[PDB]
Amino acid sequence: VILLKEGTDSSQGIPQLVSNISACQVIAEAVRTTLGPRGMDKLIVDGRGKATISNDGATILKLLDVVHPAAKTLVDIAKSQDAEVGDGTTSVTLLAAEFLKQVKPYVEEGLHPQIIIRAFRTATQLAVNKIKEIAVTVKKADKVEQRKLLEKCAMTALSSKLISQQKAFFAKMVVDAVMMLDDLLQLKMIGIKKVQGGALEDSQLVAGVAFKKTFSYAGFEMQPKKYH
Amino acid sequence: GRVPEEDLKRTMMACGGSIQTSVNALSADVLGRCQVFEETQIGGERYNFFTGCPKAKTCTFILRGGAEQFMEETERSLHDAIMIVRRAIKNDSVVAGGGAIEMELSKYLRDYSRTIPGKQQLLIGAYAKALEIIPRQLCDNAGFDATNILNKLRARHAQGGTWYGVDINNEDIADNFEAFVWEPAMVRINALTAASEAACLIVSVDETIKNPR
Amino acid sequence: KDQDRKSRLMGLEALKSHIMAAKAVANTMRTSLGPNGLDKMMVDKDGDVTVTNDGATILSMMDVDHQIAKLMVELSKSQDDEIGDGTTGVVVLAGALLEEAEQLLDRGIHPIRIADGYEQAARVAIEHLDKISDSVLVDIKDTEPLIQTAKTTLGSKVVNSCHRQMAEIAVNAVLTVADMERRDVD
Amino acid sequence: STLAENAGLNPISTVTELRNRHAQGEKTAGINVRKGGISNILEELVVQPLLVSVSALTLATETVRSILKIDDVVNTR
Amino acid sequence: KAPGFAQMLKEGAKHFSGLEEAVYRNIQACKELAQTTRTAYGPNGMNKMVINHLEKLFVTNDAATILRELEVQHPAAKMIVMASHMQEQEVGDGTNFVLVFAGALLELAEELLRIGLSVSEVIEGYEIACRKAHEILPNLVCCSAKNLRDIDEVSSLLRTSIMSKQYGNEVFLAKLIAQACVSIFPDSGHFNVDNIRVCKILGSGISSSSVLHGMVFKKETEGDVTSVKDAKIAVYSCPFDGMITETKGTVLIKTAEELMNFSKGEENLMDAQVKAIADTGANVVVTGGKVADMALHYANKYNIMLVRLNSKWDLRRLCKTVGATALPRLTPPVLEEMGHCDSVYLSEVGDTQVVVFKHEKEDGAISTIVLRGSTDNLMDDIERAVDDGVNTFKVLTRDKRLVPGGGATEIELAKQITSYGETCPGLEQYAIKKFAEAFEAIPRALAENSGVKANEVISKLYAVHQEGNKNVGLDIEAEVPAVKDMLEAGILDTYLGKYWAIKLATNAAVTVLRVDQIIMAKP
Amino acid sequence: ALSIYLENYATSMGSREQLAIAEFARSLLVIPNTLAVNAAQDSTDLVAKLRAFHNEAQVNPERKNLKWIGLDLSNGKPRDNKQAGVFEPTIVKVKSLKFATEAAITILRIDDLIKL
Amino acid sequence: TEVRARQVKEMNPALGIDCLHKGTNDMKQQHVIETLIGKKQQISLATQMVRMILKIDDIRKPGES
Amino acid sequence: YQDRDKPAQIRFSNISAAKAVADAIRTSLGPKGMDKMIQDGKGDVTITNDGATILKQMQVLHPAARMLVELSKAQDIEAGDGTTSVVIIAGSLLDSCTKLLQKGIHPTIISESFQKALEKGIEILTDMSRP
Amino acid sequence: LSVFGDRSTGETIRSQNVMAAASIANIVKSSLGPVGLDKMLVDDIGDVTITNDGATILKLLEVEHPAAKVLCELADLQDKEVGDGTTSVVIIAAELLKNADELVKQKIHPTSVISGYRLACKEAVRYINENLIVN
Ligand SMILES: Nc1ncnc2c1ncn2[C@@H]1O[C@H](COP(=O)(O)OP(=O)(O)O)[C@@H](O)[C@H]1O
Ligand SMILES: Nc1ncnc2c1ncn2[C@@H]1O[C@H](COP(=O)(O)OP(=O)(O)O)[C@@H](O)[C@H]1O
Ligand SMILES: Nc1ncnc2c1ncn2[C@@H]1O[C@H](COP(=O)(O)OP(=O)(O)O)[C@@H](O)[C@H]1O
Ligand SMILES: Nc1ncnc2c1ncn2[C@@H]1O[C@H](COP(=O)(O)OP(=O)(O)O)[C@@H](O)[C@H]1O
Ligand SMILES: Nc1ncnc2c1ncn2[C@@H]1O[C@H](COP(=O)(O)OP(=O)(O)O)[C@@H](O)[C@H]1O
């Protein structure tokens, strides 16, 4: 009759942490195969039956909206990494679930959670110090122009792809499109449009805005196409 | 006419005008400007475009190919190619990608954990093995044998390797620094910090409370 | 939100389940391939009744709620504008490649590795087709054999009763809008 | 592929690699379990007589042909 | 079929029989209340993934927020929760002291009742030990606040209260809250937490925070006026939008020209409405909801400072300080109900413009701590540390007496009370000795939350106290289960925090022991 | 001592044997981990303290780094067994590692069971 | 297999299948010829669809509760 | 098709029983062959990897599976080596026959075809051998 | 297949032999060292032989399992050859199997594990011999 909970579901101790560790691995499995350029795609269907195919880890987590409490922590952390950077959400999501998996058997053996936190806070700072000590600055290495090194980095992602035979042309289109912008660079600014048919090398790079122009109404031999 | 709103709004930020629904308020406040405009013949169809706009912080890249999957697969890879070039100019300090930096930290933290007596030894070592997942899944997703690569990769770092990592193209290890597979060091630093800070929030939790509603 | 009753299946059990759906769309159309293909009785939502063996019309009416099958239909939507004829050949070949891929998943091959293998073989096939090709109207604008070859394919459809008069009409139309020298027909 | 599996190697890449070495080379290419990988078996001195491989295909195929010809079995008394 | 339930005749309530130990069951409800907060005790307290009633996720370790969100339905637990609410009166800390200590008194009482000792004799021992503890606690006073109003002094003593709410960042918060508290202590005999307000702003991190005088509001000034010294501040709850007439006011429009005529008539009316604000000698206006586009220019026409306060608590905060009350009509020229202020100006701090109500002409006894944080849940948890931190020094305006922390007093007070029970003959010694062991639960909580064998901490804390080394507490460290001096480290607790906590905890435990049967009723 | 040496030796060989030699290294720690539990002490700390004094012997041969440090069960602290006199025969540690390895090999080769 | 063996043993030029039950194989005589662009896009679109399906291993859709 | 009479179920019954004997003896092939545990009815247990000894201690009851056991004895009498390789080859050919029979190929056509591969097979091994 | 017995294959057979050897180790794990705890030995009749010696336990320990009997036969080899260290043998062998069984779940073949453990024992005996002290 007189109980304390009366609907208030609550559990504490080691079983709660282990339950959150397993729930976090589910979010990892949802974005485990999408790591890298050649990662497997993921098909997502909304309520209306509309399909969504994408191998981007950030876009996948936005569409899931998992209701588990522990899973929301990773999603909000990964979402912040997307807003601040736009890349690395999968690495953050996988490493977090993997830090939790490796300390899982020690948590079951009676190791306190707070001792585990001192290790991550300690190992993290040592890792951040090792990155800066071993990292290398590359601005004018080998007296090569930046337009050439950036071409190598561009074709690297495009290597062994469907445009591998003509990636020299496509590699220059990336460096050209980025160099056209001002100091404030952003991915959304540089748009892309698709035109079926024709050779791969015929891909054009308009400096301004471009569109198909399906307008085929009357008006020819008038309406001068050039304006100052 | 028949211009998509995205192309119109893309030209709005490029020209610096305003898309006014009704034609009654059309005036110099909403009207845009440009330096050179010309109608071309890309692939036979006409493509209008204003070049040298006042707020010309945007552009467009028209793709061509034998099908949509040639362009769609090309569309995905170029968007990251823009980010790679966008990243190298911003941050000059970089590290080897493909999990090369993750294996170096695994060597440093693991060798450091031995000199740390106490319960932090097993945990800092556990932190090191957790970094193996980044080069591991790149091998598993690429269809390679993670055992033969990770064992051959972890052995190279012990002999003196610092940039060797996973090569998604060839099923073998490669110097990702010499191969120009780079990533920003500060972006990778923020990944470990957000990872540990995210794991610490879950580890520091011991009980869940739920108001009955 | 709405995590309850969420679809959750991955690994070989998911790929084989996806391959199972594509095979059903292929096996349904494998019999309608060629002039001796078996027709398909389509009943419209309005209660109409139609019978045909057109690969494109079969896919447009086939409202398969499976998502993997919808992509097979979206593929054929583009093929009608490029190839025109072998719309069943694309779906039948895709179902064959997926059926043979199922034998490879048991051997322990990754799907991305099979994807790279078919891309390599597809280039070998495309390279071989040019070797065994032959020209018709090379270095000359001619209208006689252009009427002959197009007339053979039309003989399978309901235009067989007056198939010859249709082929001459399709030549003067393309010849009018487009020039055989430029070789860019719209 | 069974020998490669027992030797810790990949069953597919081992026979897949050897099928190219046999198209280009000869029968010397085979699995060497002593070293744990593909090697020139002619140099390792790991050989067997011809009757083992010939009698195996001969007797095995005759059993497969015999089993294939079984339409049904009848229980007598 | 007989024999049914025994001692069940009042609405069929679950009446535990003599074998089922009805008293033992109300104690178990209180022990479960302690385990929900025993882990959050100390600087290494474990956070709780609390799910609000609005299905909102919050990760915190504050006791008052845990119980406020945890619907405690058992009445035996409500009494201890009511002591926590009474703990908030006269002091702003020691909440988990009530939960952990009372849970140990009841948990240890079961060991006495199981032996056969009467519940009425157990109560007499705890009441005697509570009276004895109040005599020993003054003798444990190690240091006392100099009351020099020094930030170096106020920040040093404040570090202990800030920790266990937001650990690691105890240096910044101690300096900021010290700067806010020192500026009001000159107002002798009037210090209160209501003066030191808090304003959270989305920002980089906690390090980017600072203190500013006056009632600060994060919403920048919407108008174009930079500063205005006008006293009359007109507060309106109704937003600037299309007017509606309280009478019939039927508006019929048919043609397009009539639409433009009525539209112009509204703009001419709104121009007269904002004109009335300046006519009443008030160049300041506040709005709750949206602000219109034409009314915005009217605020700049007469140079009326436009103010936007979307939060309701922000509006009521001004109603009780300046006096400007919100009226239901949109811009009624009611000059009588307006406010009074010495200075109102905009200021940019941390790359953000914030509205300020500074008291330049008047002496001024109000302040505000502008917190910066990249997460709303993080700033809210830091706000709870400000209340527990500021209230620590609201108590120091009273008798300034500090005692050691880290479980140091809990062992000495237990050691002094255990000796009193050993020499005291009779049955009260059993409950007096267990009253001392109840204090040991607090060091056991700090040791368990730090990953240390608690029995080893009690063994060492008693040895150093046996040698007379008072002021020795638990050394918070994962890899060092030893102890250290709390005086040298600077860890100090408040006297009144322990006094009112030991008092209210004993009354809550005694009040639960006095109850033996929970019975339903009906009006 | 073998926990550190074999873990470093594993990085030199590779070839699908780096993990096995590493697990062989981690498996030996059960002996000091089991002896610590039986001695009523924290096995995680004492096992970590042994590997630290033994790892420092590998980094450099300087005398500041302690060497050949054992485990004292009574005091619950590492101690140099050369002074304490906690010695064992060499054939014991040699045969026990050989026989234990042959036993795990004999069981790992069992991938099937046939009952009659 | 009979047509394939004829493409090697009988003669090297390609030979088709007589589906209409005409005289024999060698569709060149039967005048049944398809476009080179047709076959190139046929097996290309088919491969592209197989790669797109092989690179999908999770179809997630929330259910109605 | 109707396929009223189903005598093919006996082919799949004999192929499955034949493939089962090969799947067990497969892992014990070569010097690195994984050992197997045999337990006698009395209680004794033994460990071995010789494929000949395992087949004898299997107590095979199916007729088709017994043909593989008697087949292995024929290899021992004739050659004395390759006892395990024979049963593995027969199990894979029958497993391969399961794919051909589903395609509508008759066992007699499959039987006569395998003899042609055997005839050409012996020529391949004999040509590349070392006299 | 029809037979006069029973068969069971797969990776679970390795796990069943792993958990068996792990069980036999736990019977003589807490009794390791001079401060080892005593353990009862309930015979079939009802006698109770209480002792902490690991060798005396394994001689009287009767677990009807093949994998456990391998470790019992292993005990006789160590007792006759040396006469000590039998308890550490069963405990070391049990952890090598529990760790190897995890590698097998990571697609590591037992032959690669058997090769690694053989080389580790060789190098371990080398490092031991290089760090002795003569009588
Ligand atoms: N060309 C490449 N070669 C090897 N590794 C790569 C290559 N491109 C990306 N990677 C790796 O893929 C991982 C994920 O990259 P990315 O997709 O940009 O981030 P996320 O997966 O978090 O969205 C990175 O850790 C990087 O090391
Ligand atoms: N007259 C013919 N003789 C032999 N084969 C033919 C003939 N007509 C069509 N085919 C074959 O039938 C297949 C399908 O042709 P068609 O019906 O035009 O395409 P779809 O079946 O996709 O509609 C083609 O691959 C072609 O080789
Ligand atoms: N650095 C420290 N070392 C030891 N004990 C500490 C330290 N910081 C805080 N504490 C202890 O944490 C206890 C709880 O503090 P607080 O959270 O403010 O009260 P409550 O837990 O009642 O809300 C105090 O009794 C204090 O002794
Ligand atoms: N030392 C070795 N190195 C490589 N392969 C071997 C070696 N010994 C045997 N094999 C291979 O293992 C197979 C089986 O050999 P064997 O055990 O003699 O016959 P069975 O397994 O039938 O008893 C043979 O086909 C042979 O090629
Ligand atoms: N005096 C000692 N101090 C510390 N450890 C000891 C001492 N004597 C024995 N041991 C440990 O006890 C373990 C078991 O010793 P012993 O009983 O001789 O072998 P077993 O237990 O195999 O019969 C050894 O591994 C050794 O490390």
Residue numbers in the entry:
A (entry chain H): 6 to 233
B (entry chain H): 312 to 524
C (entry chain E): 18 to 203
D (entry chain d): 463 to 539
E (entry chain Q): 7 to 529
F (entry chain a): 418 to 533
G (entry chain E): 473 to 537
H (entry chain d): 24 to 154
Quote the original article.
TRiC is the most complex chaperone system identified to date. Here, we present an ensemble of cryo-EM structures of endogenous human TRiC throughout its ATPase cycle, with three of them revealing endogenously engaged tubulin in different folding stages.
To describe the complete TRiC ATPase cycle, we produced a cryo-EM map of TRiC in the presence of ADP to a resolution of 3.3 Å (termed TRiC-ADP). Noteworthy, there was no engaged tubulin density was now observed within the TRiC chamber, but only the central unstructured TRiC termini density remained. Corroborating this picture, our XL-MS data showed no cross-links between TRiC and tubulin after the ADP incubation —indicating that, under our experimental conditions, loading of ADP to TRiC could contribute to a release of tubulin from TRiC chamber regardless of the tubulin folding status, and the remaining central density between the rings was indeed corresponding to the unstructured TRiC N-/C-termini. We then postulate that the dynamic nature of TRiC-ADP may contribute to the release of the substrate in this state. Furthermore, our TRiC-ADP map and the XL-MS data together revealed that the tubulin was released from TRiC chamber after ADP binding to TRiC, while the retained central density is the TRiC immanent N-/C-termini.
